Amino acid sequence: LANIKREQGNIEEAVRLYRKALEVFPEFAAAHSNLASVLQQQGKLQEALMHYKEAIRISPTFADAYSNMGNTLKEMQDVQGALQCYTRAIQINPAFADAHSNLASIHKDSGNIPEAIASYRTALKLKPDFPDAYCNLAHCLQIVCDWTDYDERMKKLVSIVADQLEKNRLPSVHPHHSMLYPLSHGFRKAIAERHGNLCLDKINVLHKPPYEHPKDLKLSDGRLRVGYVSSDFGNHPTSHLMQSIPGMHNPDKFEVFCYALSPDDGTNFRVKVMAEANHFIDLSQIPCNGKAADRIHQDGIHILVNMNGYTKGARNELFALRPAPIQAMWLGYPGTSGALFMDYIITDQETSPAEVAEQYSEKLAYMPHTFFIGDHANMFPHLKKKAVIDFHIYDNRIVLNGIDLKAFLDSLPDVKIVNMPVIPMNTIAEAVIEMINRGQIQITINGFSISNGLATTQINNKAATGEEVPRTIIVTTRSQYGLPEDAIVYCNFNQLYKIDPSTLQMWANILKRVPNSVLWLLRFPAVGEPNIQQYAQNMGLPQNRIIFSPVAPKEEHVRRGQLADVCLDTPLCNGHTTGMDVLWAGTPMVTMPGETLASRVAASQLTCLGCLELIAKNRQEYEDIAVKLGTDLEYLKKVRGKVWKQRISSPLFNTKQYTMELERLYLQMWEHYAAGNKPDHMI
Amino acid sequence: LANIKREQGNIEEAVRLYRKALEVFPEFAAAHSNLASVLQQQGKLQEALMHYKEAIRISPTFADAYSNMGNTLKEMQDVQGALQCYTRAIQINPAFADAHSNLASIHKDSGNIPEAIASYRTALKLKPDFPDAYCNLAHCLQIVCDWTDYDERMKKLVSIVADQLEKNRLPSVHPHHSMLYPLSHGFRKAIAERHGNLCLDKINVLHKPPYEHPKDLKLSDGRLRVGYVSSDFGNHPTSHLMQSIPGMHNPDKFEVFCYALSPDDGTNFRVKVMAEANHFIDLSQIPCNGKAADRIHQDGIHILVNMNGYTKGARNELFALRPAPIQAMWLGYPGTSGALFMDYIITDQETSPAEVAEQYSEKLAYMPHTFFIGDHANMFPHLKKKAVIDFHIYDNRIVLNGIDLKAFLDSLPDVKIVNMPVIPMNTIAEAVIEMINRGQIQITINGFSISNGLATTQINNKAATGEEVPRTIIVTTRSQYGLPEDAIVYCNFNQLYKIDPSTLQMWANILKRVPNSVLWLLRFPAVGEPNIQQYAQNMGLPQNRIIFSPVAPKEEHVRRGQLADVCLDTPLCNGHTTGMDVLWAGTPMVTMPGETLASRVAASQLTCLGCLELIAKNRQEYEDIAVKLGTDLEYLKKVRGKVWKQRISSPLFNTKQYTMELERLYLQMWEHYAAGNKPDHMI
C-alpha cells in the first residue's frame, strides 16, 4: 500500500498495513521490502532480514532491497554480508547513489578513509543533492586533515543544516561532529534536540505510563541511589577517567549502581568497576529498552547518570523513559543532549560560564573546580617521580621512571639532586644508551631491571594498556622518537581531526618564531600525515620541522609526554582525556578556550591546576605564550616545575576529593527536588 | 650487512648479523627493517613490529618498511592497522606493486572480491612478472566464476608453477587451490611437497633431537593412543562430519586425545568433543611448536591424526617434529601432504585407486567403504522421515519434518500412506500455505507448533546451526525458494568456485534437453551470480532457467535439499560435506569422478550408498544420467526411493560402524609397525 508507505512516523500502523497488503497480494516484492525496512526501524533485525530475502526471491534484481538488506546486516554486525549486498546493489545498478554511499560508510568504519572518500564522491557525482553523503564525506576529510575547498565546505555544511532544521528532518551532521564546524549554538543545540527527539519516538511506540518516582530517602535506609550508565566500563577513555569513582562513594550516604551497556571485555577496567560498585548490572544482556528501563526503576534510582550522550554504544532510549527523577549528563559527552529528558549537565564555571546557559538545553550543575577528572594517580603512579641521565642539565631527554626507582638510584656510586635525581655518564649511563641504540628489550643493572620504553608490550602487555602498574624501571628518550636533543619539542597527541587550517597556521607561526624547535604529532591516522606535511610546506616550513610518531599503547603515550617541553592544545576541540595525559607527565599545555564546551575543557583543566598564564584570550596571545615558553628557558623551567608539583597538590587528579564534591552536588540536586522544585541551575 | 640479507635459509644466522650491523651503526633503517622481517619469519611479531617502527622513525618515507609492517600487523590480526600501513606505502609510492598486492589480499579476506580484483590488476600493471599476484588474482576470478580469458589463465598458471618448481622456490599456487587448475599430478604433488618442506625448515631451526617412540602397548595398559589434531573442533564442516567419532571409540582398546588448534568458540560442537574425548588439549594456548609437540610426545601418542593439511588454522610444524611413530592424514584435507613426515592418508579404493598411488606421497590406508563420514543422523534426525501436503502426488513441493511429526499426523482426520504420509487440502493444509505466503513465523495446529522453514533462527538459533535438533514441526516448500511447482529442480549447493566453463556447459546441455526444468544455485558468494547468469545466456538459455537462493543456516540448507529432484555434482572438485548434505535429504546426486582425490569423493559416497547408476564415466554419460532422471519420472521415483532408504541401511551415515572400521585400520597400521616394518599400503 502506497498508504502504509506514507504513514511516516506511525511505525506500528505502517507495519500492520504492509501485512494486510500481503494478505491481499502475497507475491508483492515491494511490500516485503518495505515491511522489512520498518521491522528494521523497530529493531526486529531477523524478521527484517527474512522479508528482504522474500523480496529478493520474488525480484532477483531488486537493487534497493539488497542495499537495504545490507544495512540490516550491518546492524547485525555481519559486515562482510553487508559488503556483499551493497556490492551486489551496485552491480545491478552502477548509478545507485545510496548503495555507493552505504559502501563508503563500510569503508570509513574499517578506517579505510581513502576508499570511503572515493565512494562518497561516486555517490555525490550520481546524486549532487545528497546531504547524508556530503556530511559523511566532510567527516572523512576532517579525519585525514584534507582541507581542499575548506571554507566552501563549511558554508555548504551550515546550509544543509539550515535546510534540514527548517524542514523538521533529522540532520545529516552528527551532534558529536557539530562542534567541528562553524555552526551557531542554536544550530548545535537543535541538532542535538533532534537526536533526543528520535529517542522519544522509538519509546513512545511502547505506550508505557510515566514511572512514578521515590520522593523521600526512606526505602533506601537514607541513601541516595546513583546509577551510572555507560557503554564504556572496559578499555575505554571513560574508564581511564573515572574507574575509581564508584568505589570511593561514601557507602553511608550513597548506593552506587553501575549499568553497563557493553558486554565484559575481559579487561581489569571492567573488573574494577564490577568489584567496587555496590551493584553492577549488565544491560547488554537485556536488549529491550522497556525491560532495561524497568530494571532501573525497580532499583529505586534517584539520580541516573548518562555517560554516553551521542557516542558509540549509547542507549538514550533508557533516559527518554524517565526511569528516574533526576537525570544528568556526566562526562563521556562534551556537549548538550538538547533533550528535554536530561535535567542537568555536570560541568563547571570555566567550561560552561553562566552567560552561555543557552548553548545548553539542560540546567548547569557545577563541580567546584573542573568537572574533568583522570585516574592517572592510580593508573600511572610510576610517573609521580622521575630521574634523568646527563650525557648542562635537561629534564626531558633521557628519563627513567619506576616504582622502585629510589632504591635503584641508591645502589649507584654517584647521583646528584637538583626535586630531580641526575645520573652522570658512567658505565651505567652507557649501558642504558646502548640498550636503546640497539633496540634491545631490557638490561639488568645492580639486580634491577631497566626496560626500553619501546618494548613494554613484550615485557608486560597489561602494564602497556594501563591495566597494571609496570614492575620494572622504564627508560624513555628523545632518540626513541627521533626528537632533537638540542631544541624545543612542542607536542600535540590528539587525533588529527581536531586540527583545522587556522590551528596549523598558528603552529606554523610559532615554529617560524622559534627556529630551534619541532612540532611532535601522531599518525592518528597515518593517512593524515602527508596532508599535514603538505600544508605545512605550503606555509613555508621545511620537512624536518614536524615529527610524526605512531600511536602508542596507553602507558607509553602518557610516559612519553615527559619528553616534550610544551603541548599546543587544539582550540577547535581540545584534548580532554589527552589533556589530562599530558599534564600528568608534567608538560605545560597552551590553550585558547572557544565557545563550545569541547573548546573550553583544557582551560578548565589548567584553571583547576592553577596555571592561568597558559590560557590564551586570542590567537596572538596563544602564539606569544608558546614562543615565550620555547625561548625564555628559565620561565619554561618555572612553568614546568609548577605543572609537575600541581598535578599532585591541586584537585585535578584527586579522585577522592572529586567524588566528595560530586556527592555534595548530588545532594544539592536531590534536596531541591525532594522539596518539589523542578530542575534549576546549581552553584 | 648485504651479507645477512644473503643468508637466505639460515634464519638465526641472518638475525645475529643484522644485530651486529646495528652494533657498528645504530642508526641503520634498512637493517632495522630487515631484522624485523626475519624476526617476523620466526614468529616474533611484537619484536618485529618494534624494529619496523624503528626503521620508520629513522626514515619516515620508507615505503617498504610500512608494507612489511602491514604484513606483521595482519599476522597479529590487527587488520585495520595493516590497511593503514599498506595504504600509507601506496601514498608514498603509488607504483609500489607489492603494497597494492598486500592491499588486495586484505580485500580478498574480507570477501570484497571486486576490490581485491582491481588492486591485483594495479599490481600486475606495475609489475607484469609477479607470480603471487597473478595466482591470487586467478583465485579471486575463480571464486566469482569470472572466466575472462580462461584457457590462457590456466596455461599461464601451469607455466608459473613449472618456472617455480624448477627454481626450487615455494610456488604461488596454494596446494589447496591446485586441484582447480589443470596441473599434472607430479606438479600438484610437488606443490604440496614444497609446503611440507617449509614446515621442516621452520622446526629444524630449533635443532630438536628425534623423539623416541613407544614400541609396545604396555605403558598404556594395552590401549592404542590416538591423537586427533584439528583447528576445527567448533562450528566447522569438520565437526559436522566427525564430532561423534571420539566418543564412539572403544575405551577398552583406544585412548583418544583431541588436540585443538583453535580456542573454544562457545558452540555445542566444541562442547561435545570436549566432553567425549578421553582427553582434550587446547594447543591454541601453547603457541610454541616445540612445547606443543613435546606435550604430544609425553602423552604417549601412537597414531597422530592430521585433520587440517593445508587449510586454515593448520600447524603442520607439529607433524614435522614427528612426535609420534604413525602419522596419518584423515579427513579435513582432500589431497596429499607431499610431506615425508606423513605416513598414511586414510582414504578408500574408489577415491584413491591403487593405480594412482603416485598422486600421493603417503601410503594409502583404506577404509572399507568410503573414508567419508557425516554426523547427519545425530545432527538432523528430524529428516529421517517426512510428510507432504497435496495441493497427482509429489514428494518435494510442500514438506513437513519433525521429531513429533507422527503424533501430529495422528491428530488429523484424514491422512493417506503411500513409506510417505500425505496430508490432503483441508483447512489445515490452507492454514499452512497461508502462513508461508504471508511470511508468518509459525502457527499452532491441534496444539503442535508448525514452523516456517525460513524463520528457524527466530524460533531456535541453536537448531538453525545444527547445534540442537529442532523441537517444532518445520514446513519447507518450493514457493519459499521461488522454485517451480510443475517442473524438475536440479540443484547444486557448493561454493561457486567449484564450477568451471565445461561444467556450466554440461549443465546448460542438460537444461536444454529438459525444457521443463531449472538449475538451483546459491549466492556463494552473491557476486558470482551475474557472471554465471551472463555465461548461461551466452550459451543460449533464458534468464529464468537458473534460480539463485542465498546461503542458508546449516539446518535449512540440509532440510531444503528435500525440495530438489536431482543434484548435479561439480566434477572439478566435488561436494564433500555438501554431498553428504544432499544425500541425507534423499536427493540423488549425479557425478563424474576425475583424477584427483577432490574430484572422486562424491563417487565414493555414492558407491558406499549403493547407487552406481549415478556415477558417470564421461560427460556424455553425465548428461544422459541427468536427462534420464529429469524425464523418466518412474525411474526418478525409483532412484529417489533408493537414496531415501539407503542413507539409513548403508554404511554411509553410520558413525559407529565407521569408527569400528577405523579402529580395525589403526590396529593394522600399528601391528605392521610394532613388528619393525616401515609404512606400506594397507588393504
Binding site: G234, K312, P550, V551, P553 | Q46, L49, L73
Partner: peptide, 12 residues
C-alpha cells in the same frame, strides 16, 4: 595503536 587498539570517543 599498531599492534592492537586504542579505543577513543566517537559518534553512535
Amino acid at each position: 595503536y599498531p599492534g592492537g587498539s586504542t579505543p577513543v570517543s566517537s559518534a553512535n
